[PDB]
């Protein structure tokens, strides 16, 4: 901080402030900015700062144990699964629910051009089409493994393709060429490692929150209710017209294979 | 089912479907013991319904 | 049809679709017995899977 | 219907669809018990493949 | 499933589906231990949804 000379620069003082801050809030989430820039963090911090707020510290961040030692639960060093802190983590303490926080943080991420030597967080692709750039070193794009040609006196990318896969490092040359193209693939913000609320520990697979899949299971589950409702004949309001026909359909049917005309 | 065919059958004759007068009588003529609880939900569901209109969409 | 509805109820109740059984349900309804229509009906229903026909139909 | 939804949850949980079991779920919901309606419901559900009915329906 | 039928059942009564008040109570009345994560996911998915509109397409 601004006090650059030796005076604290605290141990137990900030950890005590961090202590009351866990004890103050129902939900504590542990998150990664490391991908994110400085301003970019402030603006995500700004949204959270209205709702209820987040802190950084170092090993003084591991002291989820002292808060737990104060209360009775299981969000700490001891009872937890494997402490989900990773390097360059902060702690977000909140009034806000875990699912909602995940959506807040995960859903709205800020786009940010890739970096040389950074591992791609997701597949990076280039689109086909004219760059609009005149003839020059098109060769650099080919070196990168982007097929290119001059069409109509302009350098154009021949076809869409994945330049690099997820988990693979982005070469320097690649980054530089993607940047010239104006391509901004990566999404940065605070990644969620874990959330604690009310005696339970939630991991990022939980927090990315399915949600269409229940709309199909609800519609199917309602169709399971509805099905049961038409065929069963059990009529309070919905089920009731569908049943009447089941005695008639079965009869109307009974006319079709057959050999009365009446 | 028993209940659906029995009140449908009474409906073709033009006879009403009441509890004791026709619905139990048709089911008792089958040799089966009826329910009062289904017979009252089938009768309660029937009230204020036009059976002829519902058949007319078929479904 | 009263005769078709009588057949589906007789199968749902678990009783065979014959002239006596159709006649008893038909009499309980109050509709007069006509020998040929129940006789045709039992004959049409002979050799049938009632279950397999019931379900189809456009 | 609260009674139909109670039956499907009881089968999913693995518990039999009877008057006691429907009554406990119905009471937890806060809906008053009515003897006739759960009794019809158990009776309608008697002799059924719940699994085979669930899937069809136009 | 347990969760889907339980909040659907509460929806027919007109009762809301919250965590402890109705969803755990309905599942506990079944005699089953409710998984908090499954309840929490269902409540979080429900927020801001019109259950009546989704039923109205049926799928």
TrEMBL record, chains B, E:
One of its GO terms (biological process) is cytoplasmic translational elongation. GO terms for cellular component: cytosolic large ribosomal subunit. One of its GO terms (molecular function) is protein-containing complex binding. Keywords: Ribonucleoprotein, Ribosomal protein. P1 and P2 exist as dimers at the large ribosomal subunit. Plays an important role in the elongation step of protein synthesis. Belongs to the eukaryotic ribosomal protein P1/P2 family. This is Uncharacterized protein. It comes from Triticum aestivum (Wheat). The chain holds residues 1 to 59 of 113 of the full protein.
UniProtKB/TrEMBL annotation, chains C, D:
Keywords: Ribonucleoprotein, Ribosomal protein. Transmembrane segments: none annotated. The keyword Transmembrane does not apply. One of its GO terms (biological process) is translational elongation. One of its GO terms (molecular function) is structural constituent of ribosome. GO terms for cellular component: cytosolic large ribosomal subunit. P1 and P2 exist as dimers at the large ribosomal subunit. Belongs to the eukaryotic ribosomal protein P1/P2 family. Plays an important role in the elongation step of protein synthesis. This is Ribosomal protein P1. It comes from Triticum aestivum. The gene is LOC606341. The chain holds residues 6 to 63 of 110 of the full protein.
């Amino acid at each position: 901080m601004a006090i650059k000379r030796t005076k604290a620069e605290k141990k137990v003082a900030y950890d005590k402030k961090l202590c009351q801050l866990l004890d103050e809030y129902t939900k504590v989430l542990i998150a990664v900015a490391d991908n994110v820039g400085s301003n970019q963090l402030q603006e995500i911090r700004k949204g959270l700062r209205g709702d209820s707020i987040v802190l950084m510290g170092k090993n003084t961040l591991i002291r989820r144990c002292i808060k737990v030692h104060a209360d009775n639960t299981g969000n700490k060093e001891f009872l937890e699964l494997m402490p989900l802190l990773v390097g360059n983590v902060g702690l977000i303490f909140t009034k806000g629910d875990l699912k909602e926080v995940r959506e807040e943080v995960a859903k709205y991420k800020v786009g940010a051009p890739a970096r040389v030597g950074l591992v791609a967080p997701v597949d990076v692709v280039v689109p086909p089409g004219n760059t609009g750039l005149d003839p020059s070193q098109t060769s650099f794009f080919q070196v990168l493994n982007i097929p290119t040609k001059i069409n109509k006196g302009t350098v154009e990318i021949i076809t869409p393709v994945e330049l690099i896969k997820k988990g693979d490092k982005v070469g320097s040359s690649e980054s530089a060429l993607l940047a010239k193209l104006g391509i901004r693939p990566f999404s940065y913000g605070l990644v969620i490692t874990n959330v604690y609320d009310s005696g339970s520990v939630f991991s990022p697979e939980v927090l990315d929150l399915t949600e269409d899949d229940l709309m199909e299971k609800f519609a199917s589950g309602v169709s399971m209710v509805a099905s049961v409702s038409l065929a069963i004949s059990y009529p309070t309001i919905a089920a009731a017209p569908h049943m009447f026909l089941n005695g008639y359909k079965n009869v109307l049917a009974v006319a079709v294979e057959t050999e009365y005309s009446y | 089912m028993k209940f659906i065919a029995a009140y449908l059958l009474a409906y073709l004759s033009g006879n009403a479907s009441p509890s004791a007068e026709d619905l139990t009588s048709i089911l008792e003529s089958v040799g089966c013991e009826i329910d009062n609880e289904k017979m009252e939900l089938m009768l309660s569901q029937v009230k204020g319904k036009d059976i002829t209109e519902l058949l007319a969409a078929g479904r | 049809v009263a005769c078709t509805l009588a057949a589906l109820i007789l199968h749902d109740d678990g009783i065979p679709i014959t002239s006596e059984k159709i006649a008893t349900v038909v009499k309980a309804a109050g509709i007069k017995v006509e020998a040929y229509w129940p006789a045709l009906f039992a004959k049409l229903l002979e050799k049938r899977s009632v279950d397999d026909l019931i379900l189809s139909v456009g």
